[PDB]
Design a binder for these strands. Structure first.
Lengths: 116, 98, 52, 161, 166
RNA sequence: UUGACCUCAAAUCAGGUAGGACUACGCGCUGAACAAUAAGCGCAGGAAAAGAAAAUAACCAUGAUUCCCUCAGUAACGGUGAAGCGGGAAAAGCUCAAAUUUGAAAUCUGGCAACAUUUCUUUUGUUGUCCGAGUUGUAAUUUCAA
RNA sequence: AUUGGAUAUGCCAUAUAAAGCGCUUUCGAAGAGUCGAGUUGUUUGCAGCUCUAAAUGGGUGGUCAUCUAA
RNA sequence: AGAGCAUAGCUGUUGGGACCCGAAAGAUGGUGAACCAUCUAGUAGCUGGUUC
RNA sequence: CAGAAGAAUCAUCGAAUCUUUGAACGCACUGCGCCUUUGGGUUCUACCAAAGGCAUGCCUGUUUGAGUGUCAUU
């Protein structure tokens, strides 16, 4: 079998139309969730900083965001990752704190019974 | 502004953090109730034919043959050593009671 | 005939920028415009720039 | 060529033609009305987010960005408090203005007491005063529901207002 | 609870109590059909942890297979064919002897309203779960085809991928 | 004895459901010749499968799955031939078993009677009542990240 | 004409309720004819057969790290 | 006191059906020793041919 | 060709209809039936015709009856 790439420009267009389709549904919030900053796990790459999967629970507790609130305002949680050093904790705590500064959370209507 | 700069570096300074113990790492720890349940069941269920034979050899002080039979049945040494210790205490508790 | 014949061909991006630069330069020569079949014999000037 | 496709070629029946091919047209915006009004339909979502002053991605972009015109320490990270951010556009100000005003409208968080709740807390207060909540919770006769001091404190607070 | 005692008693399978019950019930099961309905599971601890609830729409079936492919996989498939209107949830080992291995298969009725209104077993109603045991989607079926995570467990290497610009 | 329970059957009893076809892609089982090969058999969907670590690593550590690029025609093996990292597309997490609701099976199907509702007089529910299921365990609560 | 997610607003709301966070002189259950051992076949995985477990235990890695299967 | 890297073309070479036509098949599955379908474009050092 | 004057050998299409078979289902595979209901008819108890039905496995329930069952049972 020989795989051909004639749909390469048609996949590019289809993926872009999905981003536009996604943005139409969720109008003002970002098309991606904020990702942490981590360091790759080798002696070849540990100097580089890249994006992680989600923020650790210890990073969210320091930033002031609970693990149940976090998912609702676009902050992924990684229950697996941990902070073995204070630099990873502070690098990503500041990342969450900056995110909260630039964030507008629209209020939600709440059911409110008469008494009690 | 929210933005991640990928590549280069962020800082070579290091400060090791002490991490707590995760709940999954607690697995295998014996419970006060599980130890009670097993003691009740072990007496109620009885003993396997190979455990009866192994118990006979320990009663006759033929521990060399007992350990060999347990390993031949169970498969490894540390499984045989654990079974012999478990059955030896059963004999000791039986002797104290009877 | 097979569909996986090489249909597209790569060019270094710097050669492509060279060719487009050389083709823009050629469009400022009235003689090259005439020799390519353009009826520019009454055009006031080359390059021909108009108001915004 | 297929027997099924040849069958409808040999028939007199028309095809179930559906004219849906519309490329280069982008999805129309719903959800937020403020974004919909200020959203142009020709520009991309990156161009519209930037024009409206929002961020499409809180991370890096995995490619180039268009250039249309030539350009002319844990204490201070944990105890710090970032001073929010200014609104670069009138749309972002419009979004921010709506959020604060609506939150102010929906701010009545304190709750009143029902007939049972009021009579419950009132009877406890008449015997143990208003400051001793620990002995209030330990009275089995009047505190039948066995509410602790913190629940009884919140009952009294809601009764005050 | 009593499922702690039941599940620790199920580890001593050749003890006096378990051996007598293994041989008594193995004779009883041989007098019955090859595949017969079970009024209640013979291992209420093991069925309970495999997804069984004592409610309408949950069915337990016993089946004996000859010893000497996976024995548990064939029990799931044979019972699934016998009860074609049910979905095979899971299965387990109940008994064995010198000739037969006895298994109990948990099936779920995708048409009963007590199943279709229960969000925790609502997933089995979808058509993508038609004959899960037939496509190796059960617990033993997944294990049979070496599905798992780790180094302990084709088409994308026998093909030439020719790009547009190459 | 009456009578409960467990069985074992019966009914042209009520309500359901399975078969066959397609099979490009998909998931199982089976299998020669010149290789999970064609065939043969079994089973799905609009995708399927996989999937929230009994996973990598040995680092300043990573973090479900899937696909693409790279690693790499490399290690290893005996010409076959990966994977970790790395770069992208997409991102979403969760549910049970194992706890005494024990100051109250708090749970559920069905019959019947009303009241609604509809892609729809064709659909889908609500409320009430009775019966059944269920204590050999149905709800709430908990899933190790706790 | 049929619909979807929002907005605004009227009515109803079984809240004596239900949650997140915080703190501890109190507790914290974790899946077995499986894991594993021997051996025989299919293509390490899987399968049969004989045997058959444990509780800081068990798995996979380099005393340590990581994971938490059935 | 580094000359490489990329693309295009030419030529040679090694794989794929591999210049074309050529050698009994064998295997799988069917139909009534035979017949049929596919694997198959199976295997060729050899035969014939190979265009201004 | 012919044919109708909301015509059309039209389009759309939400309502009706859709012969015998075929997974094909009363048994068979031409025929032979079973039960029930309805009706005929100048031949009325019946007969006849037609209609309604009548496959199997399995799930939930309903009803009924057996048991060599467990008891209950002064």
């Amino acid at each position: 079998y020989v795989k051909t790439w004639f749909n390469q420009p048609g996949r590019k267009l289809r993926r872009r139309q999905a981003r536009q389709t996604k943005a139409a549904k969720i109008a003002p919030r970002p098309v991606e969730a904020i990702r942490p900053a981590v360091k790759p796990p080798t002696i070849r790459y540990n100097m580089k900083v890249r994006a992680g999967r989600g923020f650790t629970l210890e990073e969210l507790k320091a930033a002031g965001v609970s693990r149940r609130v976090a998912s609702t305002i676009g902050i992924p949680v990684d229950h697996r990752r941990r902070n073995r050093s204070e630099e990873s904790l502070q690098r990503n705590v500041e990342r969450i704190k900056v995110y909260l500064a630039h964030l507008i959370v629209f209020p939600r209507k709440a059911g409110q019974p008469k008494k009690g | 502004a929210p933005g991640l700069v990928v590549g280069l570096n962020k800082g070579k300074t290091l400060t090791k953090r002490q991490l707590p113990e995760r709940p999954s790492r607690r697995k295998g720890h014996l419970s006060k109730r599980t130890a009670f349940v097993r003691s009740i069941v072990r007496e109620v269920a009885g003993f396997a034919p190979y455990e009866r034979r192994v118990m006979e050899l320990i009663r006759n002080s033929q521990d060399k043959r007992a350990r060999k039979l347990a390993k031949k049945r169970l498969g490894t040494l540390k499984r045989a050593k654990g079974k012999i210790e478990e059955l030896t205490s059963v004999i000791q508790s039986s002797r104290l009671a009877h | 005939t097979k569909t996986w014949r090489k249909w597209h061909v790569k060019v270094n991006q710097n050669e492509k920028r060279y060719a487009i630069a050389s083709a823009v330069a050629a469009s400022g020569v009235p003689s090259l415009l005439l020799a390519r079949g353009h009826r520019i014999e009454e055009i006031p000037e080359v390059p021909l720039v108009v108001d915004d | 060529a297929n027997p099924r496709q040849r069958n409808k070629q040999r028939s007199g029946k028309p095809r179930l033609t559906r004219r849906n091919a519309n490329k280069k047209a982008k999805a129309k915006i719903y959800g937020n009305f403020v974004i919909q009004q200020n959203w142009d339909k020709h520009a991309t979502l990156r161009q519209n987010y930037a024009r409206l002053g929002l961020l499409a991605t809180p991370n890096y972009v995995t490619g180039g960005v268009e250039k249309l015109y030539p350009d002319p320490t844990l204490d201070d990270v944990l105890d710090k408090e970032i001073s929010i951010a200014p609104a670069k556009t009138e749309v972002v100000r419009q979004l921010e203005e709506e959020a604060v005003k609506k939150a102010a409208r929906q701010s009545n968080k304190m709750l009143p007491l029902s007939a049972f709740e009021h009579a419950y807390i009132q009877r406890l207060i008449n015997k143990y005063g208003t400051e001793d909540f620990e002995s209030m919770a330990k009275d089995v006769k009047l505190n039948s529901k066995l509410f602790n001091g913190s629940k009884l404190k919140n009952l009294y607070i809601r009764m005050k207002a | 609870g009593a499922y702690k005692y039941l599940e620790e008693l199920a580890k001593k399978k050749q003890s006096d109590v378990n051996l007598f019950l293994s041989r008594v019930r193995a004779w009883e099961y041989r007098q019955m059909n090859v595949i017969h309905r079970a009024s209640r599971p013979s291992r209420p601890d093991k069925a309970r942890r495999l997804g069984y609830k004592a409610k309408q729409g949950y069915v337990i079936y016993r089946i004996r297979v000859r010893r000497g492919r996976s024995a548990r996989c064939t029990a799931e498939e044979r019972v699934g064919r016998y009860c074609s209107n049910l979905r095979v949830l899971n299965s387990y080992w109940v008994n064995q002897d010198a000739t037969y291995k006895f298994f109990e298969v948990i099936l779920v009725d995708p048409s009963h309203k007590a199943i279709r209104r229960d969000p925790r077993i609502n997933w089995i109603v979808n058509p993508v779960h038609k004959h899960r045991e037939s496509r190796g989607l059960t617990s033993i079926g997944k294990k049979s085809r070496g599905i798992g995570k780790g180094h302990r467990f084709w088409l994308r290497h026998n093909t030439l991928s020719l790009r547009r610009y190459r």
